[PDB]
């Protein structure tokens, strides 16, 4: 929509972006072709590490506003007045598979929300079921390793359907509750647009007087 000249990143207009500089049109590529190496270098370093879990996601910008001042239970700005509009960015995700795995797999999904409040960024990072698999964070890597492709051959992608996962489940009964939900139809939702969300943990709301209230976050879809 705005016609600029194609440049190097040092802002040098490029004449020919279809060839390398060589010695004779049939000759060796010259090291001094700094425009080539700049293009390639960049291409060479495009990728960054994907997330350890929830690699696979889709995101969108939006906004939020409360129904009425919740000042009574919490002193949190973004919730203090129905006229305060908070910007938000939201990513939905699967869990096991990588960046280039499939959306339509049997799995928990994530539903994370970044709230750019006026008093700091608030991150609400939840899944689409009301509980999780394990109780202590120390067990995270064991579980995740169990669910994830197996170490010898890297199979399977986006599936809890191999031995380790169930070996872990079969010896860690705490997992059964979420596994239940996983095997339900909540485990293969048909869109993010019709998905539930939970913060799983009991958090605290603290009002202006320092009165603590236990809370648990839900997101319900109005679609």
């Amino acid at each position: 929509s705005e016609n600029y000249a194609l440049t190097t990143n040092q802002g040098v207009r490029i004449a020919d972006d279809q060839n390398s500089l060589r010695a004779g049109s049939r000759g060796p590529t010259l090291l001094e072709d700094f425009i080539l190496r700049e293009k390639i270098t960049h291409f060479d370093h495009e990728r960054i590490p994907e997330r350890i879990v929830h690699a696979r996601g889709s995101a969108a910008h939006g906004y939020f506003q409360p129904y009425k001042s919740l000042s009574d239970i919490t002193k949190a700005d973004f919730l203090s007045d129905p006229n305060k509009i908070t910007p938000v960015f939201v990513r939905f995700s699967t869990v096991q598979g990588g960046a280039g795995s499939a959306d339509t797999v049997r799995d928990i999904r994530g539903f994370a929300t970044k709230f750019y409040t006026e008093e700091g960024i608030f991150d609400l990072v939840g899944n689409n079921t009301p509980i999780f698999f394990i109780q202590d964070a120390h067990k995270f890597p064991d579980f995740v390793h169990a669910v994830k492709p197996e170490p010898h051959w890297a199979i399977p992608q986006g599936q809890s359907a191999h031995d380790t996962f169930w070996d872990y489940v079969s010896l860690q009964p705490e997992t059964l509750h979420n596994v239940m939900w996983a095997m339900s139809d909540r485990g293969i939702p048909r869109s993010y647009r019709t998905m539930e969300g939970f913060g799983i943990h009991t958090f605290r709301l603290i009002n202006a007087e320092g009165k603590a209230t236990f809370v648990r976050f839900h997101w319900k879809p109005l679609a």
């Binding site: 409360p66 750019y116 709301l205």
Partner: protein, 256 residues
Amino acid sequence: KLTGRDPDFHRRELWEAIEAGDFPEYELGFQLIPEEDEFKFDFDLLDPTKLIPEELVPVQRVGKMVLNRNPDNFFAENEQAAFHPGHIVPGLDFTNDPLLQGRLFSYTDTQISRLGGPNFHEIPINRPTCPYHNFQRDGMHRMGIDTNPANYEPNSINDNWPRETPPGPKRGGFESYQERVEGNKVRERSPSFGEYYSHPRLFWLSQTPFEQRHIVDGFSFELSKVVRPYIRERVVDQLAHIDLTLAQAVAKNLGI
């Protein structure tokens, strides 16, 4: 599987909805429990393999969220987005939920390799829209050029700015709720966490006979892909502590 027809379905459906105008909407609700009801339940509030049932504590409608704008660049705004539950604001605070506690450490630590260093916040999609100022300095890809004569505090050369700010009703600094703590230093699971089957059961019991068939199919298809047979039987075995029908239905499909 729509995993064969369209591996990107959900990604595509969301984007295309926002294009068309039917913005996804969500209602944020809170289950609230007063501090003194902490022990009034069949289970421990801090155990994340347990749900608070809605008929005991109802979900209170609290706000509306609308998603109206697909990002411009997938990588720059999606991929590089950094969400972390320890990112809270005055008015909120944590509890001793042991899953949550550990989470708190990880989402910070994992950015350093994933996003290339401690200045990931300077990336557009992660940058606060409110003012932010401290005495931190440098780090890979620092964009912020600091003019402040001082990189420490307390300092007199800049009249000690920026200054801390005491906790208040609004625009207050952050102060943790002074929860009492009592106990020994121990690596030990709270015994109140040690009941694994009645939540699974309550869930199954509230599924329509055809929803229940689906869960039997889920278990049966997955367990079937398990190569080691004794794993199959130990799961089914566990399933029995949940509900005999379920156990058997599945057992039948796998031959036990």
